[PDB]
Design a protein around this ligand. Structure first.
Ligand SMILES: CCCCC[C@H](O)/C=C/[C@H]1[C@H](O)CC(=O)[C@@H]1C/C=C/CCCC(=O)O
Length: 947
């Protein structure tokens, strides 16, 4: 088979995942397909994860049913998986007591500088010990965390694989009564949407008892340094939850109404893309343009506000750590105390450690657990019922369609000032401290020192708020202007581009690509640039204090660029192995649920269980690699993220003779903040470059074929239907640019007011004479129509004067006044006269409005007879001279067809008609007939000679 090295691998070799290199050495050159991924451990099969839980649940049900109570399932899980989490809790108890010891040994190094005598070696080694205790917590946090994370992630897939097994095992004991009620759709939703929530629960399960413990320890440590003034920093940290939950539940409404706005646009686009051969022939391209532009305008007007909300939320998350420190320290200073450099940065670090975890992790865990319990209750209710007896162009084209480059020069200067203020606000405190220490009572004036601080604090907020809104606007205008180009381009592409491409493709494009452009890109771009600018400030602050930390940074910045590619090469292959191996599970489940009776008839109900186990083991294999390949990278990254700190600290120590406390504390407090942002910065770029493919494929349009224009300048006479004389020549056809000809040398002669009929063999080019008059596909040759050609005149000026009668009518979503006259150019009584002349006046009398009778379901409420009648009404009201009749007889014999034929024969004042048909009897009494052979034509004078 494929023995995996996860076993037979000593310790100190699976902490760095040293056993997973050959896979990368292989995938680097060959694109492993399916047979290069290892198997699973023995204790990860389904037969081993399904039987034990089934036994526990059966024992629970028995014990319960014994005494009068209701049985539960959340007690049969915990009875099996308690030792695992009992052991996993020790670590999270050990790593939460390390984020509290760093700031306590950071405040003891700084204290060496305030009291510094160069000729004293008994107090310099103790500082080295303090700094050494500070390099053992970073290793724990950064290196030993990625194995505990893998294990707590693997502790969920076991549950998710155990549930599905018993679920399926239950789906083969159902009785007829209980089966006919529930639909298979819900049984598959159980497995496709619910169990998939057990992979995130166990991750967010320890933030419920380790969140309320960290805050107490931190607010008890703060009291020993500064005092009561700590409370003034914990009140600006509990208000954010109220002031954000309500705003989010307000935000949801905008999204709801935006969706209910945009659904109609997609519906109308679906209705347009199908039936384009009728619109392009009736010249009705503008109405849809207008009633699409309106909806798009409304959608944009409703999206702007949501975008502003999200931008303000991001800007509030950016600069919340500056409103706490300002208040607490202005209070600590106004009460009567003095300021030093050993308390400030300790408090800074503690605040930064608390606010993040509390306000970002405590809320999500509750939602996760609630969803999990809901899913568990659903599955429980199920299990108890009865049984049986790219490139840079793709960025320019997307950024230069948003605004002039002046805006791209303004937002740069707007982004490169918020960070400057973010750093100067902190530098001011070090300046204050170093000026205080030099005293011996000539105290310090508070006005200056305390006003400059408020100024630096306000500028940050203003410059952090403006940027988000500006970026959002600049990035939404781009989509706003691309969609219009796309739409206006599709209304002119010939029909050739349509019959080869399927509707689903274009519609999925218009929906999903635009959704991505309008919803997700700006947020990711903004977060990425923000988290990328924070790091540069950290580095530039650490360098300016110790210029000798620029020599190793270059060796450390060249390994990242190669490692990223060495990983991404084979990281973009496992996703395919996951998806393609996941789909067969649902496929087999659906296939097996239907064909059930044919299974119970025979005593073979376990073979399918073996097949299901086999089909799930492959997904287990392909999922066991995702976690390991995601963890093989974070360790190497955290190695650097942690070596930086060691370098900084030991440099500060071996250079204690040429600096002071303020700047070293400033450097350390910024270096101890690098373990969270680096991962996010390196992780968002992946999503960005993944979803830019929609941008790429959208610009595939905006540059396509383009037929002749709609209107020239050589206008025709005010009325040029005078004498319909459609003469012909040796013109030919070409559907494809180099395809076969379906018509050869059709030189004929049609006279004014002469009803003509065309007969032939179905498939010999009988339905191709239509594509030359309306010139859908520009043919070769000459076609004179009343002393003038059809090639030196715009399409509209021609298509508008030749009325067609299609074979299969179609109705459009709207009133009964639009389908007959979308452009108001006639009078109501005229429409009434036409309708009553087409034998339909009482049919609309029944309905309420008589001018607002909405019809839907693609004209399903009427019969083909009424549809042909209303089309004849269109033709009548149009009142043209030429008339092109087509027919496809598949209706019934009753008075419908007889009446339409009588009307065609009597109503029209013998105005240049020419008919098509297949039934020989339909074409009778005509003047001249056309027999269409397999590519030529041999007509005769009258039907009296034909037979
Ligand atoms: C500004 C945000 C700083 C904190 C983000 C933190 O570094 C999470 C990073 C992500 C990144 O994909 C790599 C990694 O290990 C984390 C993946 C897990 C995310 C969900 C649980 C995060 C969780 O434990 O809560």
């Amino acid at each position: 088979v494929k023995p995996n090295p996860l076993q037979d691998a000593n310790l100190c070799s699976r902490v760095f995942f040293w056993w997973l290199n050959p896979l990368f050495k292989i995938g680097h050159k060959r694109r492993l397909e399916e047979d290069d991924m290892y198997s699973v451990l023995p204790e990860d099969r389904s037969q081993h994860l399904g039987e034990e839980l089934q036994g526990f649940w059966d024992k629970e049900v028995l014990r319960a049913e014994n005494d009068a109570q209701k049985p539960s399932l959340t007690r049969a899980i915990i009875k099996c998986y308690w030792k695992s989490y009992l052991v996993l809790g020790i670590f999270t108890l050990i790593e939460e007591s390390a984020k509290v010891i760093q700031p306590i040994f950071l405040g003891k190094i700084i204290n060496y500088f305030e009291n510094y005598d160069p000729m004293d070696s008994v107090a310099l080694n103790t500082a080295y010990a303090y700094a050494t205790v500070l390099t053992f917590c970073t290793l724990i946090l950064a290196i030993l965390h990625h194995l505990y994370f893998y294990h707590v992630q693997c502790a969920g897939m076991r549950l998710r694989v155990a549930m599905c097994h018993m679920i399926y095992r239950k789906a083969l004991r159902l009785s007829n009564m209980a089966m006919g009620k529930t639909t298979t759709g819900q049984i598959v939703n159980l497995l496709s949407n619910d169990v998939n929530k057990f992979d995130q629960v166990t991750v967010f399960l320890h933030f419920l008892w380790a969140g309320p413990l960290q805050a107490i320890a931190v607010t008890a440590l703060l009291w020993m340094e500064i005092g009561i003034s700590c409370l003034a920093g914990m009140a600006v940290l509990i208000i954010l939850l109220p002031l954000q939950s309500c705003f989010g539940k307000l935000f949801s409404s905008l999204r709801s109404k935006t969706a209910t706005f945009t659904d109609a646009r997609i519906r109308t686009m679906n209705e347009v893309i199908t039936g384009i051969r009728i619109i392009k022939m009736y010249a009705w391209e503008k109405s849809f343009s207008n009633l699409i532009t309106n909806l798009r305008k409304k959608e944009i007007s409703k999206i702007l506000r949501s975008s502003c909300l999200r931008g303000m939320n991001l800007a509030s998350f950016f600069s919340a750590s500056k409103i706490i420190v300002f208040v607490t320290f202005t209070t600590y200073v106004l009460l009567g105390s003095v300021i030093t450099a050993s308390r400030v940065f300790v408090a800074v670090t503690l605040y930064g450690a608390v606010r993040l975890t509390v306000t970002l992790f405590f809320p999500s865990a509750i939602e996760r657990v609630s969803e999990a319990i809901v899913s568990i209750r659903r599955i429980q209710t199920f299990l108890l019922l009865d049984e049986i007896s790219v490139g840079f162009q793709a960025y320019k084209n997307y950024f230069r369609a948003g605004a002039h480059w002046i805006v791209f020069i303004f937002l740069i200067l707007l982004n490169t000032a918020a960070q400057v203020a973010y750093v100067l606000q902190d530098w001011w405190l070090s300046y204050w401290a170093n000026k205080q220490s030099m005293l011996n009572t000539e105290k310090l004036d508070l006005n200056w020192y305390l006003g400059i601080y408020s100024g630096l604090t306000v500028a940050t907020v203003l410059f952090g708020i403006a940027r988000s809104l500006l970026v959002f606007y600049v990035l939404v205008n781009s989509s706003q202007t691309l969609h219009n180009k796309m739409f206006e381009s599709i209304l002119k592409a010939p029909v050739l581009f349509f019959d080869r491409n399927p509707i689903g493709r274009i519609l999925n494009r218009f929906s999903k690509d635009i959704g991505h452009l309008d919803d997700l890109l700006p947020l990711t771009f903004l977060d990425f640039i923000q988290t990328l600018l924070q790091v540069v400030g950290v580095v530039s602050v650490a360098v300016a204090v110790i210029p000798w930390i620029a020599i190793p940074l270059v060796p450390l910045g060249i390994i990242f660029i190669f490692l990223r590619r060495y990983f991404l090469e084979t990281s973009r292959d496992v996703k395919r192995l996951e998806s393609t191996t996941r789909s067969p599970v649902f496929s087999h489940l659906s296939s097996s649920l239907q064909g059930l009776w044919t299974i119970r008839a025979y005593k073979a109900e376990e073979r399918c269980q073996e097949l299901f186990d086999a089909h799930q083991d492959l997904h287990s294999e392909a999922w066991f690699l995702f976690l390991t390949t995601s963890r093989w990278f974070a360790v190497r990254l955290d190695a650097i993220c942690a070596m930086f700190v060691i370098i900084v600290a030991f440099g500060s120590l071996i250079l204690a003779k040429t600096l002071d406390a303020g700047q070293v504390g400033l450097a350390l407090s910024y270096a101890l903040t690098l373990m969270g942002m680096f991962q996010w910065c390196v992780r968002q770029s992946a999503e960005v470059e993944n979803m830019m493919i929609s941008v790429e494929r959208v610009i595939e349009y905006t540059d396509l074929e383009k037929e002749a224009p709609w209107e020239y300048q050589k206008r025709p006479p005010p009325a040029w239907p005078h004498e319909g004389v459609i003469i012909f020549d040796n013109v030919n056809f070409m559907y494809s640019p180099g395809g076969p000809l379906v018509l050869k040398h059709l030189t004929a002669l049609i006279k004014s007011q002469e009803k003509v009929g065309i007969v032939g063999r179905t498939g010999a080019g009988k339905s191709s004479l239509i594509s030359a008059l309306f010139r859908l596909s520009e043919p070769e040759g000459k076609i004179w129509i009343d002393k003038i050609l059809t090639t030196e005149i715009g399409l509209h000026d021609l298509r508008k004067k030749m009325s067609i009668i299609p074979q299969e009518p179609v109705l459009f979503t709207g009133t009964m006044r639009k389908n007959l006259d979308p452009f108001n150019e006639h009078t109501d009584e005229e429409l009434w006269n036409a309708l009553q002349e087409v034998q339909l006046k009482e049919t609309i009398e029944d309905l309420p409005g008589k001018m607002d009778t909405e019809l839907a379901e693609s004209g399903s409420n009427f019969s083909v007879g009424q549809r042909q009648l209303v089309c004849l009404a269109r033709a009548i009201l149009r009142k043209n001279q030429i008339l092109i009749i087509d027919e496809a007889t598949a209706n019934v014999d009753p008075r419908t067809d007889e009446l339409i034929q009588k009307k065609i024969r009597e109503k029209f004042a013998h105005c240049t008609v020419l008919t098509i048909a297949h039934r020989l009897n339909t074409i009778i009494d005509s003047d001249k007939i056309m027999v269409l052979d397999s590519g030529r034509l041999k007509e005769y004078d009258e039907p009296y000679v034909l037979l």
